[PDB]
Structures are given as C-alpha cells and as structure tokens.
Amino acid sequence: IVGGYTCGANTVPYQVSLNSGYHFCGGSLINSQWVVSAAHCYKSGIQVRLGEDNINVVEGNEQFISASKSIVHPSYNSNTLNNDIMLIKLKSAASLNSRVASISLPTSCASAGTQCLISGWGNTKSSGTSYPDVLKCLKAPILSDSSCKSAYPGQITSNMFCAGYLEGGKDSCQGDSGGPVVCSGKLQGIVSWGSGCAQKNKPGVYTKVCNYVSWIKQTIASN
Ligand SMILES: C[C@H](NC(=O)[C@H](N)CCc1ccc(O)cc1)C(=O)NCc1ccc(C(=N)N)cc1
Ligand SMILES: [Ca+2]
Asked: What is the DSSP string of 151-169?
C-alpha cells in the first residue's frame, strides 16, 4: 500500500496473509473454513495466517492453518487477468473471534464514488521498494468504468473495476495481491493488477467480486 496509513493491530480482522515460507499475498476470510484471494496468487504450499498484524513477530492472536484445497476460477485467464479470483479451503476451521472474523460478500455491485478500505503488507513505495511488517490501510473511491477503461485501453473487462486516485500517490502495490477492497461492509474487490503503483493516471485494478458471489456460494456449499 502506497500513501496509506498503519491500520492498527487486528483492526481489519478479515485480512489474511498467505505464507509459503514468507508472506506472498493477501486474502479475505469469508467463513471459518474459506478464504478468497486472487487467482494470480495460486501456488502450492500455502499456509493461511489469520489474526496477523506484524507478520515477522508472534504477537499472540495468530492462527496458522494449512490450505487443504485451492480452486482457481474456472475461467481465469492469466494472460489478461480476467476472472482473477481463487478460493482456498482451510484444513481446519478457524476459531472466529474479534481479531479473526469473516467479511460479508456483496449482495449487489457498488457504484463509482463509493468509498472502500484496501489493505495489505505490500510495497509502500511508488518508486523502488520498502515492505512493511505491519498491516497498511488505504481509503479509496471506486472510479467510473469509463475512466478505468480510458486509463487502461484494451485491458479492462466487465469483471474488473478501478479504484484510487488518478493524480497518483495513493494505491495498492505488489504484495497486496489477493487482499480485500471492502466498501460499506462488503467485499467488493480483490487486489489484482495495475501499471506500476501510485502512478498518475494508472489507478489500481480490482477483481469485481459482486460478479462471483453465486460461484463462491455454490462452490463452498459443494466442497
Ligand atoms: C500479477 C499482476 N501483474 C500486473 O499488475 C501487471 N503489471 C499487468 C498484468 C496484466 C493485466 C491485464 C492484461 O490485459 C495484461 C497484463 C501484479 O503484479 N499484481 C500486483 C499489483 C499490481 C499493481 C497494483 C496497483 N498499482 N494497484 C496492485 C497490485
Ligand atoms: Ca504476527
């Protein structure tokens, strides 16, 4: 997260860290057994880390649980990042408490101008690199589809939306991948892609979760 602020420990209790020896992606807890993240985060050897603030220090509220199954969206296209969503089932159910809590799925899509909270442990610099160890947060509005498509001609699909600031300075970034965009209590987006980070006229692009709620619900019910 570039241009954000330190969230505060466990203030984003649905935020998970995906760990394969090291943090590599965010995700969002959607019930005690399931996390949703980005398909571009797919790999083997995933341990889900819940209740994290400092990902380098055991602070006392963590739960570490291995993935038992990962399901990349059936239509994910890695060339275009279309359908960039993946479900991860946990080997055992997380114990839900104030610091480890699910986030609701959309009941409908969200409109341009709606304000959202984006969070993660990704890069905090727009040029060069600096990775924080505590969770960072950013408030950002959803941008119009037309400004999104104008910023990224030939690359925005119906399963994507832009959020952030066209002026630059405030954005998600590498390492925030797969993490949440929460707007009025609903998980509307997943950190997906963009050109650089926090650059002028290059806002963040996010998976449009409202398009996937039926798939998520049916997949969880059958698995
Ligand atoms: C795997 C993904 N790749 C890209 O983003 C490429 N530059 C375009 C892919 C690509 C997409 C569509 C296409 O049609 C072709 C290639 C990535 O690195 N995500 C982390 C990220 C990146 C940016 C931001 C941000 N600035 N908000 C946040 C997290
Ligand atoms: Ca920790």
From this structure: HSTTT--TTEEEES-TTSS
Among the bound ligands, name the one nearest to the CA of residue 134: 2
**Separation of alpha carbons 211 and 108, rounded Å:** 8
Please state, in angstroms and rounded to a whole number, the distance separating the CA atoms of residues 46 and 21.
9
Alpha carbon dihedral 87, 100, 171, 158, in 10-degree steps, equals 30
H helices, E strands: number in the chain: 2, 13
| Experimental determination technique | X-ray
Domains of the chain as residue ranges with CATH: 1-12+103-210 (2.40.10.10), 13-102+211-222 (2.40.10.10)
Q: What resolution does the deposited structure have, in angstroms?
A: 1.2
Residue 84 annotated as catalytic? yes
Distance 215 CA to ligand 1 centre (A): 24
Q: Which two tokens stand for residue 94?
A: 């997380």
